[PDB]
């Protein structure tokens, strides 16, 4: 098992853990802020997903400082994880293209 694949696997696991902790910590940051919607666990999990993917519909979003901090970690984990998958696909294609060229 080559490095770029172990890392893509590791990244994906690590993102799922960030999604779960982020859901949990978002609700804990946002309860106590009047008007907040990010305040029950099921939809916080959906919110962490659509944040990690950078979709950001706008149905849900943090309004407190620490919910916004949790959001940033989730965004970075998500962009980084998907970028690491992209970089692993690059490595696979580049290796395959070496062989196909006899290099």
């Amino acid at each position, epitope marked *: 098992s080559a490095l770029h694949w172990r890392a893509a696997g590791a990244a994906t696991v690590l993102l799922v853990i960030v999604l779960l902790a982020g859901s*949990y910590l978002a*609700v*804990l940051a946002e*309860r106590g802020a*009047p*008007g*907040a919607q990010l*305040i*029950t*666990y099921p939809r916080a999990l959906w919110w962490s997903v659509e944040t990690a993917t950078t979709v950001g519909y706008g149905d849900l979003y943090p309004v407190t400082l620490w919910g916004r901090c949790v959001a940033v970690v989730v965004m970075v984990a998500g962009i980084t994880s998907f970028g690491l998958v992209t970089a692993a696909l690059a490595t696979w294609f580049v290796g395959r293209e070496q062989e196909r060229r006899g290099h």
Partner: antibody
Amino acid sequence: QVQLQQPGAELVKPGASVKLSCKASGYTFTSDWIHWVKQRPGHGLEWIGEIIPSYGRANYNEKIQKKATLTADKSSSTAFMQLSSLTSEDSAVYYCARERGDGYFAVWGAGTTVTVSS
Amino acid sequence: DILLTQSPAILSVSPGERVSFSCRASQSIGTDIHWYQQRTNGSPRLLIKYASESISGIPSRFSGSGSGTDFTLSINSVESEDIANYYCQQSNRWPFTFGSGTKLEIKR
């Protein structure tokens, strides 16, 4: 099973304070919140506050004067509300309720009748 | 904070007739409304969650409908045990709030 257990009654002299208890049984999750709800005679339900025992974070109703203070004892599965400096306006039935972090109060205590008098 | 309006405060129906309780939210709250029954000297009891979802242990008689700002709790064929106060509660925005409640009264 009875999932939340509360004492039937507390009498409190005016200006004094009282700690209300709520011992939980059944399933307890890291995610569970314990809520407190006040009901004055002839009146409706009034949301007072909430605490998450696993992390110890608590929130309070702002719209009403803040006499309360919420703690939990993870070891005893018991949540406490300290109402301090009480008046006749604080005499009420105080319920505790359990919410699994999904927004509704699935189970309630029998409530503690708190009477302020001399 | 979200104000929940329950009106009328009292509802008089005849035995076995359909009855409908109204809950109105001061702004759209999706389907994040739950309904509680409180009998004389009792504590509240969850009847319906998320506007229309059945709770096991609760007679089929009870139903819920609505979304947005207008919500209804319905009893098809009232009977005496249904004599209680009925409260709605929203969990869409912090803090959770309750409606002021509606009493069911039966004209027998």
